[PDB]
RNA sequence: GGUCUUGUAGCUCAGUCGGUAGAGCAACGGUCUGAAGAACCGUGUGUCGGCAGUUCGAUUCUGCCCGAGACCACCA
RNA sequence: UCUGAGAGUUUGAUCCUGGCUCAGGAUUAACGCUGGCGGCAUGCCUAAUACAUGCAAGUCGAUCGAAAGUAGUAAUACUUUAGAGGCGAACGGGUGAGUAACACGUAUCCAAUCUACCUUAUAAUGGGGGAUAACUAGUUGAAAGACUAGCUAAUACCGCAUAAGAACUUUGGUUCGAAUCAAAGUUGAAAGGACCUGCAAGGGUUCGUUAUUUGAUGAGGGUGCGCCAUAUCAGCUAGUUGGUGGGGUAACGGCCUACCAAGGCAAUGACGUGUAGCUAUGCUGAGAAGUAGAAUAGCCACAAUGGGACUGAGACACGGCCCAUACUCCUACGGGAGGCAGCAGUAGGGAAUUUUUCACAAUGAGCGAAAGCUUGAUGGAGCAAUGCCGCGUGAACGAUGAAGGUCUUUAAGAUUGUAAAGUUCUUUUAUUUGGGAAGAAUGACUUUAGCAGGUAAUGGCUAGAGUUUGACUGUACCAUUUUGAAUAAGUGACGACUAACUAUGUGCCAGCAGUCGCGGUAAUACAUAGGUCGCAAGCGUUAUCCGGAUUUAUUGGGCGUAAAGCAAGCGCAGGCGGAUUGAAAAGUCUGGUGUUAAAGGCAGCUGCUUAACAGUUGUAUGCAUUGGAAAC
């Protein structure tokens, strides 16, 4: 037995944010060891976050990387949003599979281009009930600057689309929770059932076949090329056909074996978090921001139409215009794709405002639908954000 | 693996004691027949050879063929 | 390929007809040359033995409507007994089920006795078949379906029927009986047997 | 893929083999060229042998153009 | 079974208790087709008496095949 | 999967912390041969892979990708 | 019974010899293109490269002690086995690197041998003893494990009486070194269990165990025969060759040992070299014969490498042991653990080849009083058009000829072309409903009916019953099942060999090509278009097999000038060779016998609906041998 996966409980996707060097890790590690206690199935994951040189040899995060631990009510799988700008295309990926998201900024660091960049990511890829939790609590004298960090986090969920009421500020120290200060211990319960009150399930549905987008493939002695991903629509048992899409036209293969992080499933249902071997498949033809689907809709296209809502300078975006010959990096739901401004007829420059539907070609062909939620970023700063309204092949 | 190993070699040790044991009797009672030639130690002989003979220890051939080539030797008188 | 997709041109280019010579005589002022854009004209590139042995091998396979692997299996098969080999597969040519019906005359088109047995509606001995490369026995009843009394093509070529007398039928019921081989007389003249069996050596 | 070296033909228009790019090669007899009896293949994982040679595109690699 | 796959025939299995199947038989005593049986079965029965007169005992699926024709009626007769 | 490097004429490469785009082959008009080639007088092409700071000046500073190149992934 | 194709290619041009290429099929196939489907077959030959994870050999509580749980106050009863006992584990699976000689096969000898389980007839089931596993208490160790002190069983082990018959010899008997008898001496057997009957004694049936022994079987050995290339490889061999004594062997045996001799093979090719599993078989041709040794079967070796040996009837033991070698794993650095050329599977190389699939249902096998258990064997499934076959990519009617395109390039026509539309029909398949095979016309279960030497019955022979054994099965198949012409074709060539022609472009630049050879500005050869021809659900390419290649000339060449007659001769071996009488049969031919596995090659028949496919029937050359023929 491949250690079989059991569920019963509404599955989650909860995921930690921030800069880093805020002790991403040790928060991480407090929180998993926290509901260790409220059930099994948790252990402390502090140092198996880390996979990549100078990941673990100087204690900081660079890619997204997944945990799971259940409950008596609720089923969770955390994911580690990293800093370090210039690896944000990093942390949307973790975006592109969460369902709750956790705030972790400093205090005396109030915020930084950091948060604002990543809560204003979170805003544009689709995803509500933003969570706030402070951290550092345990430095001395926070009476007077504990609140102006809430208030500063309440007005600037406003300042993207998010909104500073209906979630509470949980407030509190995880290295200490670390340690295992009870206080502290206590406070992280207190910020799980804060999560509890909010970010509900996801809806089951079958009528849709088949769809899932890969984070990232691996090979396997003895197994062969595994990738991994989440479910989006319908149901997934063991030895069925599939077809790929991204970056290539269409190719058809066969499943082998799931998994949910090394725990075999027997019956995959939608928005589980999981991971799949393929039949006869080479690891060159399944990549990082490709997908998986089922016959009966799909077609893949380079250059399409869509709205975008475009950000300000003052809002952090470009000051300036720009040519046909722009070419920013686009960060569809779970792909990071080069795409040039092919501007339409009568539009040549998209400066603050003018919300223009703007015609863009893509390098790599993408899985595409009328309502598909993307961002545009270039120069190191995002400069844009919209959906897909239009469909002109 | 097969787990009917262990248990083999450990059957085989007291086999091979008691078998070890047997054919250096014999080897004993040949060496006796070589310092001396006589009737009743040649039944002693006799004996041993038809006790060994009772198990697989000894070929059917085999303690005919050297209880020959003694015998050979015992015509002598 | 199991239907060429034209019958027409094949009989216009290679001389020879589906029917007697009925199909092509007149179908408002025809041609009468080779077909081709340049066929009017100029008519050869290599003509020889050979060349019309080809010929005649491609007016028999086309006219019985069987892929060349097939006419190379028969012809294998009839390897396998004794006697004038040619003759006895001759004879053989038209003893298909296809074959027979046609002889029949229930169809004035193979393919379309092709059609109606693959469908499944022809009655061989209380067991349906489907395949038209059955082989047949001296002394064997055919029928089709009564239920396909109501086919409008086989009600106008009921009344309408071909005489070939090495097989006898009744068309009020559509039952008939293979009984006795074929001729020379009975089958078409217009392709020479021995040049057709002679090239099939190499297998 | 041994130490031996061979010479070939560069069939089809255009030479477009670089130097370090991968080669797969073919057999088959030739008199034109003194010292070389070999060809390459022309339109498969690097060139095309163009196209619209309806008559022959097995040979001279090139998927059928679909339209 | 041996022959096309799906459709078992499987004649007479009778040899030496240390022999492999379908490897060097000891003899062939008439055969059997499980794909359709009642006049597809039929044994030699001539020299069948003394083959098990020396060894090679009849196997499981094989005492009917010699009650079949008539051979138990003859097994015990025989050994007294 | 990320870590670095590279992109300049039709081609191959030089392009000081900007001040020209520089050489070789191809290369065009001639000199020459019966002709092809060798040799000679010379043509010239160069948006610098794509965007904003910045150097008055972006091809010599950067960030981002784009095309390509190699570099290692974890440990019972 | 049977069956043989050729063409082009030298040259101003002809003939002869002679060379070259093409025209056929075929593969353990490969690349590329096309892509419907059913069945069948097939799917590492290359790095015997190492291998994640799981599995392929277990089994028997009626063989036994003992323990645990359950019903039970308890007795006892049921369930289970950590172990001892025994059986299998020495079959079964895969791979061909090593292996070039009993490697292989065939026939005999196996007077030079063995063979437990199975077969024929048959002897016993006596009596004692001692340990010792499980267990108890620990000692060293993250771990393999090792070490001790005490307590118990058995069909375990050990003796002892005893023992038809068996074995060794002593004397005699038969006999051409074998076979049996008579007398003498000597030798060695254990184990009962289960059930039934009987109040006990005791008795009965069955199981194995001993004492045998008639057979088959399995294993092993020698010999005749020939079974890769190798004369730009002539000496080799010192247990080597032979004799003597002794020992092992399943045996004979320098197999080995102590002694004594110097022999043995060879120009009819030894020694040595490279290559390789072999055979049946498969491929090729009419044929003799040539090719490879797919899969499938037998023989042979193998288990990363090299050795050694315990066991037992069966080993140097595919998933026993030890040692060393090499890697891997960890290592408080004390030290050990592993060996997929088994089903699969990863990596790597390779142009190249499928799943970490299902059931162990059929079969076989192992174990077992018995129910039963197991078998990655076995039977299936899926992927791959990889190969063969079938079947679709509709059908009748319908033209002074829809339209367009192309040629003609231009007062027009031809071509595409029944091709198109249109009229009509219907459904292998397309899309699905319901019913729904067999393979359980196998064996075992239970009382039974009858029956046998035995009766109180078990064990057994013949017939009767079912819940029992169905993944394949939405299979096959059937019923207008619903809809439904709807679900579907490309490919090479068109100067000749080699089936098919015209046109546009570039203009010896570019490109084709197997050859002749194409193009120096109208290319029946290039790039392109149209049309056509030929193949086809496959099509062309390379790699390589035989035909042609009679191109090593048994069949089927010779040597005056095309290639060869040594420069000439004498002459050994060897080969062939006057006639007659007689012999035999050494060769030869013929009749009987064994063998030449089956499948296949040949045909017939049957079951596949048919073809393919499977089964059945008769089915060769060859050796040994019996009885003859005596022309050669």
Redesign the pocket.
Known sequence: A?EKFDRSKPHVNVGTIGHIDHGKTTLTAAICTVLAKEGKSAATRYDQID????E?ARGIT??SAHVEYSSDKRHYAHVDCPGHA??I??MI?GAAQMDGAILVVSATDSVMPQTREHILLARQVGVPRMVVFLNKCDIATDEEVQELVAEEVRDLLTSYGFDGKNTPIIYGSALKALEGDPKWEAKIHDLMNAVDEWIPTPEREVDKPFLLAIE??????????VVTGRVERGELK??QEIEIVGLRPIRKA?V??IEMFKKELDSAMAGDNAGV????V??KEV???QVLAKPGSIKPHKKFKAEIYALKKEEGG??????N?????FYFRTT???G?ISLPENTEMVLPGDNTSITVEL??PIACEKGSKFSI????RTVGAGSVTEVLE | ????????????????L???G??TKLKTNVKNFHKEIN??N???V??????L???????????????????????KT | ??????????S???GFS??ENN??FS?????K????????????????G??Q???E??RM??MYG?????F???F??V?????NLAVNLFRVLESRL?NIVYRMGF???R??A????????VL?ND?????????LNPGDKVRLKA??I????VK??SESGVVSPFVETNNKTFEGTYVRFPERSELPAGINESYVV??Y??? | ?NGFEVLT???????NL?EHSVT??????????PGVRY?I?????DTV??????????????????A | ???????????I?A????????????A?I??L??????????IDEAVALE?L?????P??????????TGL??K??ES??
């Open positions: 491949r996979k990549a040189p100078e673990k660079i890619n210039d690896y295309k990093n990926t990232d493939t691996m090979t396997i002695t003895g197994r062969g090329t063991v030895g066969v082998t074996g071997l393929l039949r006869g080479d690891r990549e990082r921001g470009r000051h300036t215009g720009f040519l010959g722009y070419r920013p990096q990071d794709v080069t040039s390098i790599a970023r270039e120069g190191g | 693996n097969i787990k009917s190993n262990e248990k083999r070699l450990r059957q085989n040790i007291k086999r091979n008691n078998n070890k047997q054919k009737l009743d040649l039944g002693n006799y004996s041993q050879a038809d006790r003979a009772r198990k697989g220890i000894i070929s059917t051939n085999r303690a005919r063929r050297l209880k020959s080539r003694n015998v050979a030797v015992l015509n | 390929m199991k239907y060429t997709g034209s019958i027409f041109k094949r216009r280019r290679l589906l029917l199909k092509e179908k408002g002022k025809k041609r040359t080779i077909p081709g854009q340049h066929g009017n004209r100029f008519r050869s590139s290599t003509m020889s050979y060349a042995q080809l010929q091998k491609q396979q086309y069987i892929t060349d692997k097939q190379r299996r028969l294998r098969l390897l396998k007994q004794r006697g296809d169809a004035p088109t393919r379309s092709r059609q109606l047995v693959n469908h499944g509606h061989l067991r349906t078949v489907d395949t038209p490369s059955i082989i239920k396909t109501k086919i409008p093509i106008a070529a002679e090239w050596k190499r297998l | 893929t033909y560069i069939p089809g228009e255009g030479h670089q797969l090669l073919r057999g088959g007899r030739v008199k034109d060229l060809h293949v022309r339109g498969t994982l042998g163009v196209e619209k040679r309806r008559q022959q595109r097995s040979a001279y690699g090139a998927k059928k153009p679909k | 079974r041996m022959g096309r796959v799906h459709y078992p025939t499987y004649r299995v040899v030496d208790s240390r022999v492999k199947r379908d490897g060097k038989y000891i062939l008439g055969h087709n499980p794909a359709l049986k009642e006049n597809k079965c039929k083959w007169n020396k060894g090679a005992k196997t499981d699926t094989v005492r009917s095949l010699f009650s079949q138990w009626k097994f015990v050994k007294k």
